[PDB]
Write a protein that binds this ligand. Sequence first.
Ligand SMILES: CCCCCCCCCCCCCCCCCC(=O)OC[C@H](COP(=O)(O)OCCN)OC(=O)CCCCCCCCCCCCCCCCC
Ligand SMILES: CCCCCCCCCCCCCCCCCC(=O)OC[C@H](COP(=O)(O)OCCN)OC(=O)CCCCCCCCCCCCCCCCC
Ligand SMILES: CCCCCCCCCCCCCCCCCC(=O)O[C@@H](COC(=O)CCCCCCCCCCCCCCC)COP(=O)(O)OC[C@H](O)CO
Ligand SMILES: Nc1nc2c(ncn2[C@@H]2O[C@H](COP(=O)(O)OP(=O)(O)OP(=O)(O)O)[C@@H](O)[C@H]2O)c(=O)[nH]1
Lengths: 59, 139, 55, 459, 120, 98, 99, 347, 320
Amino acid sequence: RQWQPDVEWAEQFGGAVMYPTKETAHWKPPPWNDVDPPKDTLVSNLTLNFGPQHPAAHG
Amino acid sequence: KTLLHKYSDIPEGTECHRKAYASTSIGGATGLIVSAYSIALKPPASFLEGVARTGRYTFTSAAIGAIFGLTSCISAQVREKPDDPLNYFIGGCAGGLTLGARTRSYGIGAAACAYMGLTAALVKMGQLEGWQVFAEPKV
Amino acid sequence: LLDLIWLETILPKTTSFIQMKMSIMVSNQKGLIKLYFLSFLITIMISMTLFNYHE
Amino acid sequence: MLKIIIPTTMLLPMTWMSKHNMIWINATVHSLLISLISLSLLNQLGENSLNFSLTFFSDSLSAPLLVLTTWLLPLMLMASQSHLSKETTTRKKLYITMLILLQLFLIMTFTATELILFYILFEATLVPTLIIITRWGNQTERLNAGLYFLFYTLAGSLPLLVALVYIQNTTGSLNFLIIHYWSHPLSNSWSNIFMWLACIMAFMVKMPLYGLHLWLPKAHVEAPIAGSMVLAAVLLKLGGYGMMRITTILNPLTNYMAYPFLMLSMWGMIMTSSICLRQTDLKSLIAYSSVSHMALVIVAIMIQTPWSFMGATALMIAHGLTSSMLFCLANTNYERVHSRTMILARGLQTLLPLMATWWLMASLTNLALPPSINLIGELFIITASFSWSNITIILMGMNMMITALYSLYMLITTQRGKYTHHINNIKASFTRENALMALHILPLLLLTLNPKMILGPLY
Amino acid sequence: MMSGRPGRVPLQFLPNEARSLPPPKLTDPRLVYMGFLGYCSGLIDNAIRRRPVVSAGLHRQLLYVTSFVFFGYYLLKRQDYMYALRDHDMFAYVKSHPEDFPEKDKKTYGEILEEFHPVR
Amino acid sequence: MPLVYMNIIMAFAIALAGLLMYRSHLMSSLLCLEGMMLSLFIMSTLIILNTHFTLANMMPIILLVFAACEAALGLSLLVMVSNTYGTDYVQNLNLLQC
Amino acid sequence: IRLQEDPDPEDENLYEKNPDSHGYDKDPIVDLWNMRVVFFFGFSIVLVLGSTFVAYLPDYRMQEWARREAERLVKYREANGLPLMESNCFDPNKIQLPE
Amino acid sequence: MNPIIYTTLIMTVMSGTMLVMISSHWLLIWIGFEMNLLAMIPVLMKNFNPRATEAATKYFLTQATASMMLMMAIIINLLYSGQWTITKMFNPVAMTMMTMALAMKLGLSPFHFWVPEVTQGISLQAGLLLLTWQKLAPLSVLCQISQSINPNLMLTMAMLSILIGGWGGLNQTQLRKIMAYSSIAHMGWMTAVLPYNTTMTILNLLIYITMTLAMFMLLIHSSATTTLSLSHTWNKMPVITSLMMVTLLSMGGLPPLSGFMPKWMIIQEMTKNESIIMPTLMAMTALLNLYFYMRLAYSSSLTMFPSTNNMKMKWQFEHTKQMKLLPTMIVLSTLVLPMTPALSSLN
Amino acid sequence: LQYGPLAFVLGERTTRKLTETSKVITVDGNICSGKGRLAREIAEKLGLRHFPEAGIHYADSTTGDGKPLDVQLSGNCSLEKFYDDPKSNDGNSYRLQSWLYASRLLQYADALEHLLSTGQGVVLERSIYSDFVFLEAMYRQGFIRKQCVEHYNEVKKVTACEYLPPHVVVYVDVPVPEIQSRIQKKGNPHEMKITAAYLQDIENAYKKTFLPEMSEKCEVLQYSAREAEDAEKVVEDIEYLKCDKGPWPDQDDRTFHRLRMLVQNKLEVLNYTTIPVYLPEITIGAHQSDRVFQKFTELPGRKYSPGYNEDVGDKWIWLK
Ligand SMILES: CCCCCCCCCCCCCCCCCC(=O)OC[C@H](COP(=O)(O)OCCN)OC(=O)CCCCCCCCCCCCCCCCC
Ligand SMILES: CCCCCCCCCCCCCCCCCC(=O)OC[C@H](COP(=O)(O)OCCN)OC(=O)CCCCCCCCCCCCCCCCC
Ligand SMILES: CCCCCCCCCCCCCCCCCC(=O)O[C@@H](COC(=O)CCCCCCCCCCCCCCC)COP(=O)(O)OC[C@H](O)CO
Ligand SMILES: Nc1nc2c(ncn2[C@@H]2O[C@H](COP(=O)(O)OP(=O)(O)OP(=O)(O)O)[C@@H](O)[C@H]2O)c(=O)[nH]1
C-alpha cells in the first residue's frame, strides 16, 4: 500500500519548536485549551485586631 | 554615510593603508550594532560576559573588514587592475577565512569564503556599472 | 562522492543549514518585554542616527 | 487553439460528472479524441509561424511537442488505473482532474504568444505535479522529493520573472514575434551578463544540467507512474521550449557565456551516464539516463546552430516517448514484485516473453540505433557540435559507448539470465500493459518514416 | 499615481464621464469569467456545508452567479474608464510637451550600420 | 528655535528612553508614559500659544482627555496582571514565551 | 499493539475471478468495453487514421514549391552568362556604405 | 461579553479605523488610532485567560508607545511648519519619527516582536480581527504621506520584515504563530512598494486581506491551533483541509493562484523604478514562506496523519456555525489572476 | 430559535426559564448498586428529566435513528472484553474509558442544554466527574498504563474545567460483599468475570476521593442501601437543602448565554476529546481511519449534512 506517516513522523512536527535546540529543549507546548495552569492560592484574607485599645471594643 | 564616504573616496588599489583603516572601521561599526542587539535580545549573566561578548563580535567584524580592505587595495596595487571585480573576490573569500578562524571551524569559514567572496565581487559589481539598491522613485 | 556527497551538499544542504542555523536565532526570543522594548530603543536610536536617516 | 483548449477543459466536468466505474473509459476515449484534433495542428507554413489569435500562436517547434502532450494524456490514465483501482471515486476523479489540469497548462504554455504568458503557465505546472508526487506517490522520500522538485525550479524561475519584467520596461512588449523582429545586440557588460544568467538559469534547471540535477533521482523515483511519465516526457522538454524561444535577445553574449555550462554539460553526460553502470534501482537508472540525454540537448541549444536546434527538437521528443515507455516498464514489474531493485527480478524474458520484446525495442531505442529518431537526433548534434569544435566527438562519442553499456545492462540483468526462484507472484501480462507499450513504440517508429514533422521550426 | 487628478470627485465609483466609453458587451470574456467565479463561489458553499455539490440549493448557486456578473460589470466599466482616462491625459501631455517628444527621423536599414556576430 | 522648546524635547527623549528601558516595574514604566505625553502636552501648548493659533487651543486639552483615558487601560491591564501573578513585575511577563 | 491498522492487503489477481480479464477494471463487462475503446480509439482512429492524415498533409514548408522556382531560376541565370547564384543577396546598389 | 456590548465594541474599532481614512487633520488621525486601541484590548480580553492577559498586555504597551511617538511627529511638524493637514511632511526628523512609529503599529523592523506573541495568547477569532482589520489604518496614513517618505528607510524596514517573517516561520509549530509570522512577511511586500506608486500597495492590501480571511476562517472551522490538531482534521473534514491546502499555495503565491497577484505587480512596478536587486531578494526569500507552507500542507491534506478513536464521535454531528461569507473568500483568494487589470479601478 | 447572538439581543434570557427545580442532581453509587434505578426513581417524583447512563452507543442514540451500529464503526470498544480479559494488548481496555468519558461528556452537555432550554433539571447517572474512579481502578489492576492515566486526566482538565460541578450528588453505599451478592444474581456471564480488588478499588475511590473533593463545590448525599428502597426520602431531602454552594448560585444571564452557546455547538463540547496525544492504546492509524470513515460515510443518513441526504427521502434537495 501507499506509505502513510505514523506518530514517529508526527513527533517531528509535534514539538513546541519545529527545530529543537538546547535553548528550546525545555519550552513546554502551550496548554491545549490555552488556559495556562491557574496560579496557586493568592488570597489576601487580612487579619485585623479591633481592640482592646479601640474605643468601639468597649475597653 | 560619512564612514562609507571614506572607503569610496579612497581610490581602490591606491593608498592601501587608509582604505584598510576605512574598511575595519566599517566592520567595527557593524560589529557594534550587532553586539548591541545581541546583548539586548540575548542578555548575558552579568556585565563581565556582556563586555566579553561584544568584544568577540566586534573583533571578528573589525578583523574581517581589516583583511578585506587590505587585500582589496593590495591586490589591485600589485596587479594594477583596480576595476577587476576579482580584486574584491580574493578579499571577500579571505574575509570568510578569518571568520572560520574566529569560530575555529574550517567548514564555517569555507562556507563564509564562498558566500562573502561572491558578495564582495557583487558589491564591486554594483559600484562599477550603475547598480542601486535603494533607488529613488523615478516613475 | 560527486552526486550525493557534495552536489547535494553544495547548493541544497548549505542553503538548508544556513536557514536552519539562523531560524533558531530569529525564533528563540524569551518573551521579556524588557528585552523587546530595549531593542525598540536601539532601533529608534540607531535609525534617527548614524545611518543618516535624519538627512 | 481556442480550439483544443476548450475540449481539454470541458473534459474536466466530464470526469467529475460521470458514472462510478466509467471514469477511466470516458476519460481515455475523449483524451484520444483530443489528440486526433492535435494531429492536424502539426502542419506548418514555411516561414511564418501558424498564428491563431493574439494570445496563442504555434510554430513548427511547439506543434511537434504539442501533439506529444495531447497524445501522452491517455497514457497516464492507462498506466495508472491499475494501482489506484483500490481507491475511492472522489480521489480517483480528483486524480483525473490533476492530470488533465496539468495537460491543460502545457497546451497553453507551448502555444503562448507572450513570454510573460509563457512564464505564468510554465511555472503553473508545478502545482498539479506536486499534488501528484506527494499525494498518490507510494514511498516515504516523496515528501523530500516534492520539496526538492518545487524549490529547485522555483528558485531558478524567480530570476526569470524579474528578468522578463525588466525586458518589458526596456523593449516594450515581450511576445515571441516582435522580440525576434526587433532583436538588438545585447551589449557585453556585467549587468547584461547577469541578465543573461537570469534569462537562462531558469530554463536550465528544468532540463537538468549536471549539478542542478539532484531533483530528478528524488522526484522521478518517488513519483507514481502517471507522475513519473510527465516529469520526464514533457516538463523536461518544457525547459527546451523556453530555451529555444528565449535565445533571441541573448546572442552576442551566448558565445562568450556558453563555456561554463557547456563544459559542465559535456562533462556531465559522461558523468551522468557513468552513474548508471553502478545503479541499484531501475527507476533511478531511467531517470539518470534522462539526465545524460537531456544534457546533450543543453549543448544542442547553446551552440546555436541550424543543425544544433534541428537535432535538439528531434532528440527531446524521441527522448520523451522512450523514457516514458521505460518508466512504464519499471512500473509493470514493480507492481508485480513490489520492489524497485534490479537484481531482485532477474530472468523475466523466460516468464513474460512479450514484456521481453517490449523491453527490447525500449532499450534499443535508448541505444539510439539508426534510423530511430534517437539516432537522428544525437547524430545531428554530433555533426553540428563537431563543426563547433573537433574535440566534442571525444566526449559525446564516448557517451554513446557508455549509453550502450548501461542500456543493455538493464535489459540483461532483468530480462535475460536465469529467473529468480522464490518469486512466484508473476502473472501473465495484462492486455492493458501490452497495449500501453504498443502506443509508445509504434508512434516512435511511425515518425521515423517522416522526420519532417519532428525536425522543428528551423527545418 | 490618478489620485488627485484635477476634478476627481471622491467616492464616485462610476464618474458621469465614464459613460462616454463603450460599455462592456453583455457576453464579455472577462465578464463571463466573473460569472465563472460566481459558479465556483457557490460550488464550495455546498462543499463546506456537506451538501450534494452538483445539486443542493440551486437558488444559492443562482444568486452567487447573478451577484458576481453585476458587481463585475460595474467593476469592468470603471476598469475601462480609468485605462481610457490613464491614456487620455497621456495622449494630451505629449502634445503639451512637443519639444520633449521629438519623434526621430526614420533611416531605413539600408544605411544603418550594426555589427554582426558569427556563431562558432 | 529657543531653549524652552528644546529643554522639554529632551524631556520627552529621556521619557521615551525611560519607557523603552524597563527595569523591573511596569507600574514605573506606566508612570513614565503619562510624563512622556506631558512633554507632548507642554510642547503642544508652547507652540500653539506662541503662534496665537486661536482655534487650536482646544487640541492640548483633548490630548489630555485621551492619553489620560488610555492611561485607565494602562492601569486596568496592570491591575489585572497583578492579580494572577501577584505583582507588576515584567519578569513574570514572559508566560507567553512560546 | 502500537495501533489498530489492517495488515498489508493481498495483491489481488484480476485473472483469479475472471481469467478472460483484460487488466482494465474489476467488472468483466467494462473490461471488454475498456479493451474495445483503448484499442479502437488508440490505433485505428489515431495511430492508423492519423498516420494517413499526417502522411498526407499539403506541401510542408512549400518544399517542392521551393524546388520549382529553382529550375526556372537555374535556366535563367546560366543561359545569359550571369553567375548562377549571386554572392551578395541584398543588392549593394540599394544599401549605402558609410565612410 | 454581552453580545450587544461586543457588537458595539467592534463598531467603534471600525469607526476608529474609519476616522483615520476619512480625515485630513493630523490630530483627528491620532484619535482614530487611539480610539481603535481604546476598544480592541477588551476584544482580546473576551476569554480572560492568563495567556490572553499576557498578550493583551504586550499589545497595549507597544501600541500605546507608537501612538505617543506618532503624536510628536504631529507636533514637531507643527513646530516647524505650522500645519495640521496630512500633506508632504515638512520636517525630516518628524517624518522619520512618524515612519518609525507607524511601522511599529504594523511591525516590520524588530517592532515585529509583539505581532506573533500577541496573536498567540488572544483567541483565534480575535486574532483574525488583529491581523486583517487593524492593519488598514496605519497603511492608510502611509499612502497619503508616501510622497515625503525617506525612500532609503522603509526599504530597509521592508527588507528586514520580509526576511525575518519568512526566516522564523520555519521553526514555528503553532498555527497562530505561523499565521502572524507570514503576516509580517507579507507586510514587507506592503511597504517595499510604498514609496513608489501606492496603487500596488492597495492591491496587495486587498488581495492579502481576502487571502487571510480564507486562511483564518478555515482554521476556525477546523477549531485547530497546533499543526497536529490541524493534521487530525483530515478524518472528520477531508475537504476542509483540501481548501486549506488550496489557500496554502495562494498563501505562498504560485501562479495561476492569485497569491502571486501582489508579488508580480510589485516586481513589475519596482523594476520600472530601476530597482532590480530589491525585487530579486524579495522573490528569493519569499520562497522561505513557501517552505513551512508546504510543511503545514504536508501535514494537512497532501498526506494523512494518525487520527484518534474518539474522533469517530465527531463524525455523527454537524457543524453549527454557518461560516459567514467564507465560500467566496476562498474563490476570491485563488483564481483571480486572469482578471488582473482591475487594479486600475483601485487608483 | 437558537441562542445565536440575536437571541440574547431581542429578549431571550435564561433566568426566566430556570425555577426551583432547575438543578442537575447526579445519582451515583457502587457498581451494580442499582443507582440507575434510584436515578430513575428521583426522576418521575420531582419531575426531573432522566438521562440513561451513557455507554458506548449513547452518541449513537443522539444521532440519526439511534440504531447502535457496529462497534468498530461506533466506538471500537466493548466492555464485555474488559470483563473477560482486561489485560488485552489491543488497548480495548483504555478505549472504553476514553470513549465512555466522551460519552459522559456528551450526556453532560445535553443535560445542560435541556436544562437551559426548558428549565427542567437533569438526573444523570455517573457524571463526568465520576469517570476517573474507573480509570485508576484499571490503572491499579494494571489494565492500563500510567500514560493512559495522564492523557485522560489531561483531557479531563481541558474539558471538565468548563463544566460546572452538579448541585447535589447521590450515592447509594454498597460494600464489596453486597456487590458480590448482586452480581452473582445478575447472571450475564461477562460481569461475573470481575476481581474483588476491582470492586474494592471502585468503592474506596468513590468514598475516599469522590465524595470529599466534590463536597466542597456541591451538596453530597451519602446514602446507605436502605434508602434505595425509600426513594421518597431523597425527594424532601434535596428539597430541604438550600443548594447555596457551587458556581450555580453565582452566575447571571450572560454566563448562561455563554454556556448555551458552547453546548449548542456539539462539535465544540467534545472538540478537546481528541487532543493530539499519540497514545498507543487510543491512536488509530491512517489506513484504518480512512476506510472506517469511508464505511461511516456510506452508512445511510450521514452521507451529507442532516436534512440533505436524498438516500433517506429529503425531498427538495435541489432547493434546500
Ligand atoms: C566596501 C565597504 C566595506 C568594507 C569592509 C567590509 C564590510 C564590513 C566588514 C564585514 C561585515 C560582514 C561580516 C560579518 C560582520 C559581523 C560578524 C559578527 O557579528 O560575528 C559575531 C557573530 C557570528 O558568530 P555567532 O553566530 O554568534 O557564533 C558564535 C556564538 N558564540 O554574529 C552573529 O551571530 C550575528 C549574525 C550573523 C551576521 C549577520 C550579518 C552582519 C553583517 C551585515 C552586513 C554588513 C555589511 C557592511 C558593509 C556594507 C554596509 C556599510
Ligand atoms: C490549480 C490546480 C488545482 C488546485 C486545487 C487542487 C485540489 C486537490 C489537490 C489535492 C488535495 C489533497 C488530497 C485529496 C484531498 C481530498 C479531500 C476530500 O475531502 O476528499 C474526499 C471527498 C469526499 O467526497 P464528498 O465530500 O462526499 O463529496 C462528493 C461529491 N458530492 O471528496 C470531495 O469532497 C470531492 C468533491 C468533488 C466535487 C465535484 C463537483 C463537480 C462539479 C461539476 C460541474 C460541472 C458543470 C458542467 C457544465 C456544462 C455546461 C457549461
Ligand atoms: C538561488 C540563487 C540564484 C540562482 C541562479 C539565478 C541566475 C543568476 C543571476 C541572478 C540575477 C537576478 C537578477 C536579474 C534580473 C534581471 C536583470 C537584468 O535584466 O539585467 C540588469 C542587471 O543589473 C543587475 O544589477 C541585476 C542583478 C545582478 C546581481 C545582483 C543581485 C542578484 C544576486 C543576489 C540575489 C539572488 C541570489 C539569492 C540570494 C539569497 C540590467 O539592469 P542595469 O543594472 O543595467 O540597470 C540599468 C542601470 O545600469 C542601473 O542599474
Ligand atoms: N470505564 C468506564 N466504565 C464505566 C463507566 N460507567 C459505567 N461503566 C461500566 O458500566 C458497567 C456496569 O456498571 P454497573 O454499576 O454494574 O451497572 P448496573 O448493574 O446496571 O448497576 P447500576 O449502575 O447501579 O444501575 C461496569 O463495567 C462499569 O465499569 C464510565 O464512565 N467509565
